[PDB]
Amino acid sequence: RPRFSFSIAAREGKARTGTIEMKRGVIRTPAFMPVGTAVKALKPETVRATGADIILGNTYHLMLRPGAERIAKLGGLHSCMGWDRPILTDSGGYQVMSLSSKQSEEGVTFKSHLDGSRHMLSPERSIEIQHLLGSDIVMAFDESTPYPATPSRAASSMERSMRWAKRSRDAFDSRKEQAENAALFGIQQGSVFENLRQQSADALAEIGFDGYAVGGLAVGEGQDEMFRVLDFSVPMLPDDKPHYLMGVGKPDDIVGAVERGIDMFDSVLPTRSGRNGQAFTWDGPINIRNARFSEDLKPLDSECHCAVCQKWSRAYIHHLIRAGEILGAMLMTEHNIAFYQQLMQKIRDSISEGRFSQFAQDFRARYFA
Amino acid sequence: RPRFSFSIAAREGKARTGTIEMKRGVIRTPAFMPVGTAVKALKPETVRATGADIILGNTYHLMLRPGAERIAKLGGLHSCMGWDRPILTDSGGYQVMSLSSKQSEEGVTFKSHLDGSRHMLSPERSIEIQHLLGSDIVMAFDESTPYPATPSRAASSMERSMRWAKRSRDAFDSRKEQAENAALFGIQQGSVFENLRQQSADALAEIGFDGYAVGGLAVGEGQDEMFRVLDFSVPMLPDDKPHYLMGVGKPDDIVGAVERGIDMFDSVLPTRSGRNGQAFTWDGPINIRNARFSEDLKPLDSECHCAVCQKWSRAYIHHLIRAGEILGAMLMTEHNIAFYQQLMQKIRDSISEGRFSQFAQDFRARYFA
Numbered sequence: 001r002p003r004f005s006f007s008i009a010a011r012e013g014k015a016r017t018g019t020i021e022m023k024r025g026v027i028r029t030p031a032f033m034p035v036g037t038a039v040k041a042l043k044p045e046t047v048r049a050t051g052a053d054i055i056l057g058n059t060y061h062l063m064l065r066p067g068a069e070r071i072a073k074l075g076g077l078h079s080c081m082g083w084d085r086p087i088l089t090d091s092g093g094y095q096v097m098s099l100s101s102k103q104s105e106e107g108v109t110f111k112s113h114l115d116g117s118r119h120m121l122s123p124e125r126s127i128e129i130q131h132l133l134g135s136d137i138v139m140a141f142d143e144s145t146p147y148p149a150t151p152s153r154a155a156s157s158m159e160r161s162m163r164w165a166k167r168s169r170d171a172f173d174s175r176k177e178q179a180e181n182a183a184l185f186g187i188q189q190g191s192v193f194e195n196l197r198q199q200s201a202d203a204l205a206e207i208g209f210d211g212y213a214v215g216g217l218a219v220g221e222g223q224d225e226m227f228r229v230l231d232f233s234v235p236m237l238p239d240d241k242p243h244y245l246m247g248v249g250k251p252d253d254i255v256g257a258v259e260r261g262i263d264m265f266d267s268v269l270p271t272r273s274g275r276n277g278q279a280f281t282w283d284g285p286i287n288i289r290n291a292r293f294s295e296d297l298k299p300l301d302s303e304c305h306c307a308v309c310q311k312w313s314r315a316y317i318h319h320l321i322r323a324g325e326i327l328g329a330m331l332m333t334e335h336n337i338a339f340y341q342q343l344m345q346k347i348r349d350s351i352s353e354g355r356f357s358q359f360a361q362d363f364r365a366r367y368f369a
Numbered sequence: 370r371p372r373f374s375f376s377i378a379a380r381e382g383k384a385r386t387g388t389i390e391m392k393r394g395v396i397r398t399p400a401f402m403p404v405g406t407a408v409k410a411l412k413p414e415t416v417r418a419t420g421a422d423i424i425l426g427n428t429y430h431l432m433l434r435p436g437a438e439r440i441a442k443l444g445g446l447h448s449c450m451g452w453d454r455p456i457l458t459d460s461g462g463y464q465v466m467s468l469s470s471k472q473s474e475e476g477v478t479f480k481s482h483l484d485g486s487r488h489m490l491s492p493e494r495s496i497e498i499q500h501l502l503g504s505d506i507v508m509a510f511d512e513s514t515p516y517p518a519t520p521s522r523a524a525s526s527m528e529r530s531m532r533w534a535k536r537s538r539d540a541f542d543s544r545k546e547q548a549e550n551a552a553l554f555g556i557q558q559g560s561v562f563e564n565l566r567q568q569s570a571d572a573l574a575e576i577g578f579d580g581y582a583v584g585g586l587a588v589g590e591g592q593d594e595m596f597r598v599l600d601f602s603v604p605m606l607p608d609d610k611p612h613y614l615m616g617v618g619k620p621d622d623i624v625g626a627v628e629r630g631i632d633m634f635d636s637v638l639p640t641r642s643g644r645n646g647q648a649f650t651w652d653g654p655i656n657i658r659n660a661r662f663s664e665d666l667k668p669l670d671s672e673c674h675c676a677v678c679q680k681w682s683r684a685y686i687h688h689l690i691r692a693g694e695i696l697g698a699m700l701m702t703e704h705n706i707a708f709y710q711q712l713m714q715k716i717r718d719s720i721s722e723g724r725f726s727q728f729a730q731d732f733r734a735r736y737f738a
């Protein structure tokens with residue numbers, strides 16, 4: 001396979017389906033990428049069985065423990081965790097802002113939320129860390145914008161983000177092994193402001209990336225506003241490269257983003273929700289802890305094809321979750337991730353067959369009944 | 370298969386190897402029975418893959434939640450948890466003593482360590498609960514003796530235990546479905562006193578059971594004393610029925626019990642140890658959390674055949690355990706249980722080949738090097 005080749009097989013309105021080929025394998029788009037770090041209750045083989053083509057690794061988590069350099073010594077992340085397919089790594093930027101406890105044009109210095117140890121993160125160091133991890137898709141390091149943001153603050157952060165995007169680009173290109181085997185995604189900023197989004201997009205396309213993420217959404221703006229920003233934002237990005245909506249999200253959010261031209265997704269919802277007792281179903285999410293499931297012999301969802309729905313009842317999982325049993329988290333998570341892959345499969349199939357619009361309508365009618 | 374048939378294929382000194390046939394399957398003895406309730410981090414298929422022929426279910430845990438009657442309504446325990454092979458259930462007696470917060474000749478009343486709810490447990494009710502669970506091997510309800518115990522207190526508890534053994538026997542026989550499809554084990558008491566152990570054994574054999582457990586050990590007496598009590602105690606039990614040492618134990622303990630004629634074992638060590646970072650190896654247990662394993666690329670054990678040792682390094686598991694990741698507990702537990710099954714297999718093989726004594730010596734030399 002090549003380093004990176006995105007091919008679009010079918011379109012419907014703004015929606016696209018197709019594939020990304022990478023040395024470690026093929027990714028079907030639109031794609032959901034389970035978070036491979038951050039609950040972590042599945043073996044890689046199990047993650048693959050749900051249908052995942054690629055997983056996401058959190059750079060921030062890994063640079064703290066066991067450490068980027070240690071992971072390289074051990075043979076890199078794929079080898080360490082036993083996942084041999086592509087891995088996309090975030091830049092570490094977001095988590096440094098939210099999970100960590102000083103910013104500059106150079107980058108960011110911070111203390112670990114764990115032992116209070118000090119670290120720097122710059123475009124160059126983030127890119128180097130992702131290299132040491134062995135990541136297949138590398139995210140440019142950027143500066144996040146809080147919602148809500150003033151036009152001035154959004155402009156400045158977006159502008160710094162474009163400068164850092166160029167630094168990320170160059171750092172990645174100067175490392176031969178990384179440039180030849182990995183891909184680099186740029187990230188569009190601009191908050192909710194159309195003009196900033198346009199300048200960001202023009203700047204990113206000028207630099208040139210393998211893929212373009214839409215950053216700054218899913219940060220408390222609401223679905224209406226998110227969709228409104230996607231409406232004008234995605235068409236600004238190059239049409240022939242993948243579009244990646246970071247941190248999204250709920251099933252209905254995913255369906256709408258695809259309708260607006262997004263090809264790639266990640267979210268902690270399926271794994272996080274798993275531990276808290278929330279199972280996704282075609283009839284909407286349920287909380288298995290609810291007393292109404294104590295003697296319910298049906299699977300989590302009536303149509304789901306996952307191994308959990310073939311073998312165990314709501315009644316049993318209700319018990320496992322309420323009793324704090326680890327198996328409970330294992331099964332809720334396997335089912336949730338499987339449900340998400342089945343969602344993406346129905347999206348890809350429906351686009352391929354030119355009936356995605358009808359699928360989106362039928363999906364919502366039932367899901368929100 | 371029959372209700373219950375214990376057959377001895379080979380002997381070496383006091384050690385025996387052979388099989389128990391039951392309707393739900395065959396059990397190879399000497400046998401280790403993983404605890405299927407109580408960390409609970411494995412799917413049944415995974416437990417079976419480690420080589421387990423039978424698992425143990427904790428009656429006390431299950432009567433509290435989700436409740437014996439609810440389990441029956443749901444289709445019984447095998448169906449609920451997805452394990453279709455034999456299940457042995459304890460009587461609930463021990464846990465009521467230790468985990469719960471009033472005793473009589475009738476039984477015991479107690480309040481749940483959870484919501485402080487009230488419950489009674491008698492020989493009859495314990496037997497009924499195990500029936501409602503659907504258990505294949507049912508333990509008689511008895512009264513535990515604390516270590517250390519006076520001869521008088523040991524005598525009285527043992528005597529009550531024999532009266533309760535007869536009540537357990539009758540309760541079990543009066544339920545047609547249970548008597549025809551399940552087996553009943555009696556439990557020898559007497560503390561460390563030879564004469565009491567003899568009266569207990571005579572009393573149990575007079576009543577008549579499918580198997581005989583040696584109770585009252587592994588309760589703080591030490592290995593020397595335990596072995597000393599097994600020395601005179603096991604030969605008192607009928608030779609043609611299985612001998613079950615409850616709550617044992619460490620690998621070296623198991624090897625010595627078998628040399629003294631025990632056929633069956635259960636212990637929380639492999640599962641409990643798993644969560645705390647202790648892995649069993651042929652060179653002794655290790656604590657994977659230790660800093661010395663942070664960059665150790667070898668499997669948990671160099672010879673182990675389990676899926677964990679085929680796929681993951683100490684270095685990675687060290688990270689999972691230290692980071693509180695659920696996968697860490699899953700892998701340590703799968704390996705520990707697998708190691709225990711490999712131990713029993715080498716015991717059965719060595720007895721079959723008349724070289725168990727040599728195996729016991731070689732095992733200890735290396736394990737305690």
Ligand SMILES: [Cl-]
Pocket residue numbers: 036037038
């Ligand atoms: Cl990790």
Ligand SMILES: [Cl-]
Pocket residue numbers: 405406407
């Ligand atoms: Cl359970």
Ligand SMILES: [Zn+2]
Pocket residue numbers: 037038061065688689692694
């Ligand atoms: Zn981790």
Ligand SMILES: [Zn+2]
Pocket residue numbers: 300301304305306307308309310335336338339
């Ligand atoms: Zn499912």
Ligand SMILES: [Zn+2]
Pocket residue numbers: 319320323325406407430434
């Ligand atoms: Zn339970």
Ligand SMILES: [Zn+2]
Pocket residue numbers: 669670673674675676677678679704705707708
């Ligand atoms: Zn192993």
